[PDB]
Design a protein around this ligand. Structure first.
Ligand SMILES: *SCCNC(=O)CCNC(=O)[C@H](O)C(C)(C)COP(=O)(O)OP(=O)(O)OC[C@H]1O[C@@H](n2cnc3c(N)ncnc32)[C@H](O)[C@@H]1OP(=O)(O)O
Ligand SMILES: CC(C)(COP(=O)(O)OP(=O)(O)OC[C@H]1O[C@@H](n2cnc3c(N)ncnc32)[C@H](O)[C@@H]1OP(=O)(O)O)[C@@H](O)C(=O)NCCC(=O)NCCS
Ligand SMILES: [Ca+2]
Ligand SMILES: [Ca+2]
Ligand SMILES: [Ca+2]
Ligand SMILES: [Ca+2]
Lengths: 467, 467, 466, 468
């Protein structure tokens, strides 16, 4: 009926210098790589790009950095993109951060005819207050700072006003597509490709398989054809796998993972951070079913897959190749972060560089030293879900991690419920710390020295660990 | 995995008096009838319900009107429900109107943890200014009124602020579901069941088929299981078809429909309002192939099916059984109105009760006389899309439906680009009418006494008609 | 500091397209000498914010003759035919603003407040938009007013009003020094305080110039820092519009005598022109109530004796007036802060139309009566109890008491009590409840003289003051 | 003679039940209703909440309510020289919630004017917007309660703070004169918050220093119309308490900073001088340069200290020092004063500093734990358009750098400073970093670099001139 097929070169030739783009992809999962190369071939300059990340060294959007085609990047996470981080530090790229769920919802809103919407994410963080270093000069100093966000009260609580994002073009990748533009994605490579296809004026879409109209069930289309302007069928290539993890000294981490595992309960939908939170899922009791949720868009997330099941389309938040359990369900990034922001998870476990007696949490940033970005961290804590920090008690140089107020910039305000460590377990109660447990026959006087705040120690049982 | 399956009675038993429900379904399509029947049996009352429509006489929400179990209703369209329309008019039930796209997004936001957002829909209409009668006394007069909505400028355009809808419960109906909650819908019976399922505190799902965890493909799940708390498998029953339409005197309607069908250009994505705009679908030139969009969750809407193809899950905005073309796509009601509100439709044609030189349209009500509701009309007119109204020139009394200013409540101000009558074609330019085409072949002589206003007229031509 | 200048020298900087703010209520406080100078050097396409547009051959009104005005932003036209004529003919653009909003927005422009919230004008055409701000040259609509934003604070809805900062500000005062301190007399203060704060270059005509040191620091009303240029025009008499002095078929009197029974001891009240003002007279018992005037006075007395008349002491209806002992003056921002803040105990108005809803229409008839909101919108949108004194029916038999307002509304759900010659209704829960009937006139005739149903279950007879 | 609202001191106070929110007039002790606060101490209300600029001073005004622990919470801009007030905060008896002085004034006007909320650029990007200034302690020194955040919103290019209107159960004011139907007149800088305080109260009570008949006050000279006043009190004549009776009868780096800053003045400037080093630069103005000094407590045309006979408690500056006034000076209330400041009508603001940054940030109201006094008028004075010129010593006690990369102390304002003036050097803030302009004596350039705190531009550098 309706045909939108083009060659790779012709579809890309409209993109003028100064063009704003929206690109799907979580790491390399769902990255339109074949189109990013053709953009590089044509030599467009001063590009402004809204994308979850910036691909990686020599892949997807990452490849556009090579001949300095990027003016600005609006992202949530840098990742292992050395060119990007270097060009930002050396004053070649302007880097503006924005939390992952907001970024997805701003794209959706800009496609939905919704100019602005409220969210509790990044409230009280440096992102709302502004001042994060968006651009450097060539020699060392700060050239530009991010502008602040508007705040407003609904109920008792404070929310940020996020503006809609509308781009000149949109680049998406899909597993399948028909001639009239109906895209069908696969695994967690869906992510931003759905809201990315909505926010763009001219959306172009590469497909790993082309099919005729009729060959796709109308009941299975994730991105309907009205959205797509141009479909492209590049030569088939293997998607880059960052961390090819498979199923086949310093383990105070194991002790935290065993206490952390007693936070789980039958019927919980949980999100686990990288490191110790993920470890705690290994120590779950016998018939206690819990569903792990990966923010790139899945529930029913399993351990590393057997060799025979490794797929670039099925990875976790840390870009590690993952499997999935029976009763699984895939969803886009706007839905994924609606699910999170909506408080639909029961337990969110997370590492931390610094955790305050407030309930505050620090990891996101260290100004001009660590510049990874917020990722999905600010969305995971600012929602109403129960948040449990799992971290060591002190830094390796003896300083407390658990403090009164955060010296470091904040991931979220008044969010943390429990703080599990190798020595102790506190609960936050009324913006003030309560010592609930301590480790095997170790003392209350010890932990008191190792943390940088006073706490309630009026009912201290001994810490239990799962087998 | 998890097993959330229960009896019909035990899943409904926690619903107390005064409860708030979100209810899935469009007309009878996706109406959880089996659960509304059970809600009738245990006789709960003072019920506030959020749903697109109120079902039908003796089917769905409809059955809860029989014992006066409903206090308030929040709907977009009354539809064909005499019990409900009567109960509103004689003071028994309360009835607040909500634009359909606002209603789906308000539920989504409530699920998403977004407290508020902006939409241009319903700005300037009584629903922003407040003052639609929401309840009557028993004898005749007014009792309550709609509280106004807040407004706010982005660019130089004014937007309504819509608050999130979080309900005590959520009742949905899906075609297939597994035991850990994941739902898969069929046809245009999806609609509100997605956003409804995200917004309830305790959501409950009737399913036409139960499967084991593993039988649903992760990449076909329309509602992830995390959102679902209870799943019931009622005794199999037929979905009620309102109008069983199939492909197998004095109607001026054709004359206007044949002129309107010349607005259908090639490659256009169009939306057609119920009644007169839908009957220009016959006269699309043989070469031209448009894509019809139905607001209940379909692009690529076909003609009426043959007797063998008739499916209750495939219906239009008018609740008539419908076929689908190759390369068609289904979607939920939140997405459908993100598509419309975002200006992704090329053409939008609607009926009128009154139309004006100001660009206005009044097509949703006449007080205490005919109260159907806005439905999707307030979204379809407020977006960017070119609005073409198709109405007979004068009314059933003889008065002119074209006027200087609208007597009836406004569906949207400044929205109408062209008005197409059997006598003439008008075009609005700078808030003023301009006659472009005239018919077979009553000179301006006749047309000027049939319009309720004076208009510019220089470049006059004849009115052509399609085959 | 010394900012004294010639009349011409101060005005000469005003280019075409300049935005002005101009003080004055009616003619009192209206800088006629400076406006006349703007006429002589003939600036084109001006935008002017002011309480009104002066009068035919006085104040801002003198600038309509050569069509030097593009856009007026006022609360009240008054007795200005040129302005009313030119608006309708399509020469002048006219955006209405409630008087209390216009002053506080000038105050806000001066005070560095970008916007503020106000219950005034909520639900009216001035919030929603749609008022004809400009006609074309044939009586067709050219421009509608842009809407105001809204927002809930607590339970109720408020309009967001934007600051107004102008290129120029023209003020008039009775006294001033060379460094720019100003002192006004009587109700001729009004908008001169807030107008003086919102201009970038603010020029002041003074009736008397004095040295620095001669004005008491404690009796300055507009501080000198707000003043850039001071001018001393040749002495001239302020135009008195209605030179009022104290030297049968009257339904109007009967309404006033019933209305006078609404007054209690210790009440501060605002009464509109006409019948509300005529009730003051029949106040029973030896003195007890304070009359407020929106142009900047509490303790408004009756008309003065023939030799104690004063141009600077005039009321909202432009009439000359006396003041009682313990009376106090204030500017137009303070005046409507006082009103908007519920500090009045009673507000009595007239009406063109009143509804069972609680609605009031008394300000505008589209393309027919070009009068404007004035204070009326601010008075009906605050907490204060709002009584309507009006004729029951129109001359010609149509009911003024109706179910819903056909005409444009001054306030939504604002009226508490309606008083007519036939009847007295109270508005309870958004509907009409009949409480009194005059004479020995039956409930049957009123039922057919008013155009809505109502409760008639505890109807006394209407009392009246002597 | 219409209304009579006169009432005895004892009979006016009795209505104030436990838990009552009061709004009290006065700046420091100027315009403090003392005689009323004593009668409140007598009858003895507990758990009061009080809105005022200050909290008086020890044993004077709101100060006298701290003795019997009668205050639950204070909403103030300045702690002032009030020790009992201060300790109770740190020991954790009273709740202390700061509010910028111009916002507090305008919030009380807003309440009385029926304006539910208004926007203002003051305190945006300060700890007062973001939340987390310590509002109450426990008995040991840990935080119990923190200040909740303010909302923000963009008008034009820049961000503004939403400020909610203040309405109190009672309002307490002090006036030089009042008639029987409530019209008040004020004297000197003792007007200040009394005007906006008298408008925001449900029941407002007003101590006159002189009662007069209706007619006696000129209607044109009324500062607070009688409609606002519900009761009036005529206590025994008492002395308004002068904190610093100032009159005109180390190495001194302070004078070198002042003499440089006086060269920033210019004919026709209206200028505000902050407490400390900025005020002392008025001494060293060149004879031809005519300036008008503005005191934030309600005055333009502030003079030097008066001669011994001319001193009066009602004429005081921001530092509570007794002060004279020149020809063409004009008094005004505090809502008007901060309307004047916030409106950018000042041509030069000068301020002291605890810490100033290369960014353009200033921190001059708080160091958590030790010096907790509140913004005063500072946050308003840096958030207007007006040119900020900071005057400070180059280091502090214990030799640390007062010019820094970024402020570790809680900031008064963001990107506000245009010029820093010190005894060693004068800097400029350009685009977001520092520019060395002048250096005193012929002092070494590579001495000041690591004595300063950060790197800077140093291309076009002359020697620093001082005033005669
Ligand atoms: S997302 C899909 C939602 N889209 C919408 O457009 C929803 C709102 N639209 C409607 O309700 C209908 O589509 C309307 C606009 C009523 C269709 O009008 P038509 O163009 O079909 O014109 P008809 O005259 O056939 O209208 C049907 C009934 O309406 C009565 N009616 C029309 N105009 C008037 C006036 N001016 N005054 C009184 N009644 C009017 C007709 O009598 C007719 O009644 P039936 O009972 O249906 O015969
Ligand atoms: C910040 C402020 C204290 C600067 O002080 P100043 O009066 O100019 O005089 P100095 O610079 O000598 O400093 C005064 C005191 O602060 C101390 N100080 C200076 N820098 C300091 C620092 N980094 N840490 C701690 N203390 C410091 C001084 O040692 C001195 O202490 P002392 O009074 O106990 O002897 C002063 O501007 C202030 O109090 N501001 C309050 C808000 C405001 O601006 N109000 C006026 C509005 S009109
Ligand atoms: Ca497109
Ligand atoms: Ca739940
Ligand atoms: Ca000026
Ligand atoms: Ca009062």
């Amino acid at each position: 009926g309706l045909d939108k097929v083009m060659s790779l070169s012709s579809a890309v030739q409209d993109i003028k210098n100064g063009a704003t783009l929206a690109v799907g992809g979580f790491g390399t999962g769902g990255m339109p790589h074949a189109i990013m190369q053709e953009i590089k071939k044509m030599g467009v300059r001063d590009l402004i790009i809204y994308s979850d990340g910036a691909g990686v060294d020599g892949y997807g959007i990452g490849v556009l950095f090579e001949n300095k085609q990027i003016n600005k990047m609006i992202v949530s996470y840098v990742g292992n993109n050395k060119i990007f981080a270097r060009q930002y530090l050396e004053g070649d790229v302007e880097l503006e951060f924005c939390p992952q769920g907001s970024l997805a919802e701003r794209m959706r809103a800009g496609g939905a005819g919704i100019p602005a919407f409220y969210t509790p994410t990044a409230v009280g963080t440096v992102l709302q207050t502004g001042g994060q270093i968006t651009k450097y000069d060539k020699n060392g100093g700060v050239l530009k700072e991010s502008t602040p966000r508007e705040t407003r009260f609904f109920g008792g609580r404070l929310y940020c006003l996020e503006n809609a994002i509308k781009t000149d073009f949109s680049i998406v990748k899909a597993w399948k597509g028909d001639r009239c533009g109906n895209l069908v994605f696969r695994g967690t490579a869906r992510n931003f490709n759905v809201p990315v296809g909505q926010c763009g004026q001219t959306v172009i879409a590469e497909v790993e398989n082309l099919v005729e109209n009729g060959d796709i069930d109308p009941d299975e289309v994730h991105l309907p054809g009205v959205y797509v302007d141009r479909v492209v069928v590049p030569e088939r290539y293997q998607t880059l796998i960052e961390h090819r993890t498979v199923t086949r000294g310093e383990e105070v981490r194991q002790r935290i993972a065993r206490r952390a595992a007693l936070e789980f309960a039958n019927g919980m939908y949980v999100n686990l951070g990288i490191g110790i939170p993920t470890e705690s899922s290994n120590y779950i009791p016998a018939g206690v079913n819990v569903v792990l949720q990966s923010e790139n868009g899945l529930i029913g997330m399993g351990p590393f897959p057997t060799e025979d099941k490794v797929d670039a389309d099925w990875i976790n938040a840390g870009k590690q190749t993952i499997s999935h359990l029976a009763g699984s369900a895939l969803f886009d990034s706007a839905t994924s972060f609606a699910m999170i922001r909506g408080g639909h998870m029961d337990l969110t476990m997370l590492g931390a560089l610094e955790v305050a007696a407030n309930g505050d949490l620090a990891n996101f940033m260290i100004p001009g030293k660590l510049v990874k970005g917020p990722g999905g961290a600010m969305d995971l804590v600012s929602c109403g879900t129960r948040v449990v920090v799992t971290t060591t008690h002190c830094n390796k140089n003896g300083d407390p991690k658990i403090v009164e107020r955060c010296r470091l910039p904040v991931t979220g305000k008044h969010c943390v419920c429990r703080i599990i460590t190798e020595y102790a377990v506190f609960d936050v109660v009324d913006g003030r710390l309560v010592l609930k447990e301590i480790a095997e026959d170790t003392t209350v006087d010890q932990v008191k020295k190792l943390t940088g705040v006073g706490f309630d120690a009026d009912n201290v049982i001994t810490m239990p660990l799962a087998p």
